[PDB]
């Protein structure tokens, strides 16, 4: 009934984690239109480092392409490819 | 090579997801402390409702207890049990 220390420390240490990201956040110049879904799942560096002076940053990145819907009012439905940045590897590095 | 629309949509939609949360955000009366690890993995609602009229919110919760290292000035390193709120169910409701 209690998660042991090493299991929590290892699971929370800096690594790529599935993160749900609003598309407007990735692409704030696109906030004029409406997307469906409005957010996408991306692998992004997350978690903590052994020390507050370190930050979890990507050391390998790639693009991932997804099928997304976009509309403008009183205007046709579109479906097309949209690309997003993913993090493939992360490490704890000085800030 | 391209993630398909229905796969993106289902994976992005409001639901409990492993989220990395800083302990200070969960224990604001202990911001005098240093924790190791400094963040914990918790199940929390995330994702989108694909209606700007709606927000993703917890509808069922529970606790989980984890072993965390704790230190503060005039104290040495301790290990102790800390409880955290988890989200078991989420739904899209008006904002």
């Amino acid at each position: 009934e209690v998660v042991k220390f090493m299991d929590v420390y290892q699971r929370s240490y800096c690594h790529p984690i599935e993160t749900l990201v609003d598309i407007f956040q990735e692409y704030p110049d696109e906030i004029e239109y409406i997307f469906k879904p409005s957010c996408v799942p991306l692998m992004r560096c997350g978690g903590c480092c052994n020390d507050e002076g370190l930050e979890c940053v990507p050391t390998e990145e790639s693009n991932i392409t997804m099928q997304i819907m976009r509309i403008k009012p009183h205007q046709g439905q579109h479906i097309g490819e949209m690309s997003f940045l993913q993090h493939n590897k992360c490490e704890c590095r000085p800030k | 090579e391209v993630v398909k629309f229905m796969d993106v949509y289902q994976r992005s939609y409001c639901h409990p997801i492993e989220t990395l949360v800083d302990i200070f955000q969960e224990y604001p009366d202990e911001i005098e402390y240093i924790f190791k690890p400094s963040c914990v993995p918790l199940m929390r609602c995330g994702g989108c409702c694909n209606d700007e009229g709606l927000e993703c919110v917890p509808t069922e919760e529970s606790n989980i207890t984890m072993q965390i290292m704790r230190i503060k000035p005039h104290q040495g390193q301790h290990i102790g049990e800390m409880s955290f709120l988890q989200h078991n169910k989420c739904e899209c409701r008006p904002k």
Partner: peptide
């Protein structure tokens, strides 16, 4: 026990 890398338990007990 360099701080840039994930640790083993020995790094904490000591």
């Amino acid at each position: 026990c360099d701080i840039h890398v994930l640790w083993e338990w020995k790094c904490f007990e000591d």
